[PDB]
């Protein structure tokens, strides 16, 4: 744990594409599924300057 | 308006005339692919030879259309020519029939016209440029601490993903060292990778010899490294 892992979707119809990205602790599980997780390490930050 | 996706798509129809198909869905589709998954299944069951092997050529060709769409001409290009220097290996030089002879030369007849238009240099298509852009940003930003994983849903995808960050300069100049990432199993889709050169990979990530994994999403149970810092999922949900 200890930061923010920047966590993106880039999808699309035809060509035209569309990104998701947030943000998840470093503490929690690498997916290749969307995943918002929680904080289990508690040393992790609520925020950082990729989300505000 | 796509010469090359054009050619490939009047191929594929030249192979459903040949073994007389015409299923309800549209090339380069994944009810087409699960389509022809189905049809050599039966083939195989019923013994039809020449229905088995037509499926089979028309997966490498639907797989092509894919990674024409999603990356570049020239890694599709490549995926095609790949599969018959391999066919051409082991079935020319036998239990070789009127089959392999048409579909072999069905794609020699175009090869040269194919490798043309992958040779001409093109525009990157808006996925790929959304793709290095992210990555661009997020190294320029992150610097030397930039540790991401790409997921893609196939192991070409990862592979030619893979080349074309080789293929361009400007990623190496932010400090991008990418390597591909993939399964042993053995697939009709690409080569394994042995569960040995897949630690070592890994390895190599871990001491940040490579920066930027692009796996398949049937690697995330051991790909749990906290030190990355980014991940992407490219054209996961399509
Ligand atoms: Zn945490
Ligand atoms: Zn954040």
Same mark, same amino acid.
């Given at each position: 744990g200890g930061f923010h892992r920047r966590e993106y979707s880039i999808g699309w119809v035809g060509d035209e594409v569309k990104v998701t990205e947030w943000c998840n602790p470093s503490c929690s599980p690498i997916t290749a599924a969307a995943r918002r997780f929680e904080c289990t390490?508690?040393?992790?930050?609520?925020?950082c300057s990729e989300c505000e | 308006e796509d010469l090359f996706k054009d050619r490939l798509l009047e191929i594929m129809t030249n192979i459903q005339t040949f073994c007389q198909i015409s299923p309800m869905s549209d090339f380069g589709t994944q009810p087409y692919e699960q389509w022809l998954i189905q049809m050599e299944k039966k083939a195989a069951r019923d013994g039809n030879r020449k229905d088995r092997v037509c499926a089979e050529h028309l997966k490498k060709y639907n797989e092509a259309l894919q990674i024409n769409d999603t990356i570049r001409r020239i890694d599709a290009y490549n995926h095609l020519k790949t599969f018959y220097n391999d066919e051409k290996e082991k079935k020319f030089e036998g239990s070789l029939d009127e089959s392999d002879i048409f579909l072999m030369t069905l794609f020699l007849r175009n090869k040269k016209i194919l490798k043309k238009l992958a040779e001409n240099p093109e525009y990157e298509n808006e996925k790929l440029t959304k793709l290095r852009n992210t990555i661009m940003e997020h190294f320029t930003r992150t /610097?030397?601490?930039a540790r991401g994983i790409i997921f893609t849903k196939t192991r070409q995808s990862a592979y030619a993903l893979s080349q074309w960050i080789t293929d361009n300069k400007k990623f190496a100049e932010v400090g991008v060292k990418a390597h591909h990432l993939i399964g042993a199993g053995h697939s009709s889709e690409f080569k394994p990778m042995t569960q040995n050169e897949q630690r070592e990979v890994i390895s190599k990530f871990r001491t940040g010899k490579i920066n930027l994994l692009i796996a398949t999403?049937?690697?995330? /149970?051991?790909?749990?490294?906290? /030190?990355?810092?980014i991940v992407i999922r490219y054209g996961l949900v399509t």
């Open positions: 390490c508690h040393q992790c930050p609520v925020t | /610097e030397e601490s999403t049937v690697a995330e /149970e051991g790909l749990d490294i906290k /030190e990355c810092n």
